[PDB]
Design a protein around this ligand. Structure first.
Ligand code: HEM
Ligand code: HEM
Lengths: 131, 131
């Protein structure tokens, strides 16, 4: 993750953040449509789950200049995900759905370059969570 | 619906409307989780579908004093729904999911009385769409 990618993440978060409630919920609607077998894993209210997911994305943006500082947080999260029935092959599916949902909601407000940067950041977060 | 119910629809819409995008999207997430097979009927972007659904709810509120006047509009909507592959048994499922999603997003901000009014209004709308 180079300086340019870090900037694109900070810059695009300024448009994601004000829209984060909708983006998170759109993500879950899209996920449950696209991957009908993962919805059974979610046991708590989706409204609160969406808030939790977007909160963590904001933490990734806040720590984007030093992600290594987030390895422990992410390792704990990955551990809980195993307890939720999540498996390694879920991560690419969730990543694609999240990025596509941001793209859908923001349209021309979200560049291909920003999409690529978020893809790398997601890939990193997922690698840390799956060890 | 009676006068008190009309007033409840109008007053509770003041809380639903500013949150209508989120409620719509939560509704689709909840619907797709409750009945995963139903998602195949939805071919267009969920973000735009949620907007359209909540637009019609706003029309129901706008016309709440004279629902009779919306019968043609609802009949046309019901006709298009038949084309989508929607059938009678879908209606209770969707109503339950919609009401529960409004309740979930607003919590105690959605009063028992308002929820009872909206339940009746949904039933009337469904009845007209399927007559
Ligand atoms: C970088 C990727 C991801 C992030 C940042 C993330 C974030 C979160 C957060 C913050 C929570 C709240 C609970 C907790 O903190 O332990 C959560 C719960 C959950 N996540 Fe993820 N997640 C990711 C990937 C995934 C994947 C790939 C799946 C696969 C389906 C998934 C499914 C779930 C489930 C089932 C729960 C528990 C829901 C419940 O409370 O019942 N997540 N996730
Ligand atoms: C009062 C109840 C309902 C309302 C107000 C409503 C509203 C709408 C609206 C405004 C649209 C946009 C397209 C159009 O105007 O024809 C739509 C599309 C659609 N609705 Fe409904 N609807 C209701 C019930 C249902 C039910 C019970 C189902 C069962 C699954 C359903 C499934 C669909 C589908 C599959 C589409 C098309 C999606 C697409 O274009 O890909 N709706 N609905």
């Amino acid at each position: 993750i180079d300086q340019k990618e870090k900037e694109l993440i900070k810059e695009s978060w300024k448009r994601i953040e004000p829209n984060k409630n909708e983006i998170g919920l759109l993500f879950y609607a899209n996920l449950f449509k696209e991957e009908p077998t993962v919805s059974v894993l979610f046991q708590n209210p989706i409204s609160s789950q969406s808030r939790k997911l977007m909160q963590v994305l904001g933490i990734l943006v806040q720590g984007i200049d030093n992600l290594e500082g987030l390895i422990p947080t992410l390792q704990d999260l990955g551990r809980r995900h195993k307890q939720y029935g999540v498996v390694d092959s879920h991560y690419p599916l969730v990543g694609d759905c999240l990025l596509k949902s941001i793209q859908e909601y923001l349209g021309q407000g979200f560049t291909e370059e920003a999409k690529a940067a978020w893809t790398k950041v997601y890939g990193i977060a997922a690698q840390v969570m799956t060890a």
